[PDB]
Amino acid sequence: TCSTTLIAIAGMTCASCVHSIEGMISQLEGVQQISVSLAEGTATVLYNPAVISPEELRAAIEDMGFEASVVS
Amino acid sequence: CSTTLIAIAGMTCASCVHSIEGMISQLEGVQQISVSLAEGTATVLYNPAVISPEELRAAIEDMGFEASVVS
Ligand SMILES: [Ca+2]
């Protein structure tokens, strides 16, 4: 079964980037779905914790040039 | 839900109005959309946890109509 993680993402200011983040993160092994809220500055990720971790997700987002933090 | 008003240029037929309604209304997070051909606008009721005015506007633009968020 999937777990959920909430990640704060700073610096998102366009639709293009929302879609780019969702595309990149969704394709990682174990990621079922990612919902980015441009309004709230967050991503909610449904993932298989046996194969990927919140800190791996966070790190992938950072690598795209956004500051990111696992909230919960 | 939140509400956004989007100005859309170039709506000059019923078929396009309905196309935009269909495409936008079916996006995840979108509860309702009303398009005004006379006023050149769409009013969208949406869940900001899931979708933004910026994304709505970009989706309309991707269909071939110039769009801007008014409020
Ligand atoms: Ca999305």
Residue numbers in the entry:
A (entry chain A): 1 to 72
B (entry chain B): 2 to 72
Paper text:
The reaction of TM with Cu-WLN4 generated a yellow complex, and the product was purified by size-exclusion chromatography (SEC). Pale yellow crystals were obtained using the sitting-drop vapor-diffusion method. The crystal structure of the TM-WLN4 complex was determined at 1.6 Å resolution. The complex forms a protein dimer linked by a Mo2S6O2 core. Two Mo atoms are bridged by two sulfur atoms, and each protein subunit provides two thiol groups for the Mo-coordination. The Mo atom occupies the copper-binding residues (Cys14 and Cys17), preventing copper ions coordinating to this site. The Mo atom is coordinated via a pyramidal geometry, and all eight distances between Mo and S atoms (2.3−2.5 Å) are in the typical range for Mo–S covalent bonds. The two distances between Mo and O (1.5 and 1.6 Å) indicate the formation of Mo = O double bonds. Inductively coupled plasma mass spectrometry (ICP-MS) measurements showed that no copper was present in the crystal of Mo-WLN4. The absence of copper ions in the TM-WLN4 crystal structure from Cu-WLN4, together with the TM-induced dimerization of apo-WLN4, indicates that TM binding expels copper ions from the Cu-WLN4 protein.
